[PDB]
Amino acid sequence: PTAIAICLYYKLGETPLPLVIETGKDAKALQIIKLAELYDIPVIEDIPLARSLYKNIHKGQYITEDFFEPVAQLIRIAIDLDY
């Protein structure tokens, strides 16, 4: 089996689109998820989306059109409203 983790970053006014700032497979995926717990970063399991992002959007790349709406949905779930 092969564990995958995609780390998405979006900051209004900085990133023009959501950015894959980190990825990992196997041991590095496990570590990404441990760190996500530590920093209270929302983690969503979505196996088709994870595999597709992993294949298509490399570290340091903005998401492309196929991903705009699925990633928007994750951002809406995940954003801290800060109150």
């Binding site: 092969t2 564990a3 995958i4 983790a5 995609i6 780390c7 998405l8 970053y9 979006y10 900051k11 959501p18 700032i21 980190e22 995926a29 570590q31 990404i32 998820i33 760190l35 996500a36 530590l38 920093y39 970063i41 929302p42 983690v43 969503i44 399991e45 979505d46 196996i47 989306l49 994870a50 595999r51 992002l53 994750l74 951002i75 779930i77 995940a78 954003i79």
Partner: peptide, 17 residues
Amino acid sequence: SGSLANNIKKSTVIVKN
């Protein structure tokens, strides 16, 4: 050292399989 942790700390959301 620490680039990975700093990237995760500032992250918005993680998608996993």
